[PDB]
């Protein structure tokens, strides 16, 4: 996965999370191949928000 | 670790401090926008510390 520097401060950072959801819909397989490298972004978002 | 324990603790510090400043703001009849501004500056410091 191409690197994404997201601090996840403002609520609108959810734009990037939204991107990932679309990726698991439009290309479920390629997403499966880069899930994990994506989870590295998701645990930043999740640490910060929850 | 995936997450610095130091940045985590500072973030909980700003959790407490931010709720203290929100308490102080609502008690002192402050406009919601200036509140959004102090809250945003606080998140900003949280990421800079991160």
Curated annotation (Swiss-Prot), chain A:
UniProt superkingdom: Viruses
Subcellular location: Virion
Regions crossing the membrane: none
Family: Belongs to the turreted BTV-fold inner capsid family.
Subunit structure: Homodecamer; each decamer is made up of two conformers of VP2, called VP2A and VP2B. 12 homodecamers assemble to form an icosahedral capsid.
Biological function: Inner capsid protein that self-assembles to form an icosahedral capsid with a T=2 symmetry, which consists of 120 copies of VP2, with channels at each of its five-fold vertices. This capsid constitutes the innermost concentric layer of the viral mature particle.
Name by which UniProt lists this protein: Inner capsid protein VP1
Organism, as annotated: Bombyx mori cytoplasmic polyhedrosis virus (BmCPV)
Residues of the full protein shown: 495 to 544 of 1333
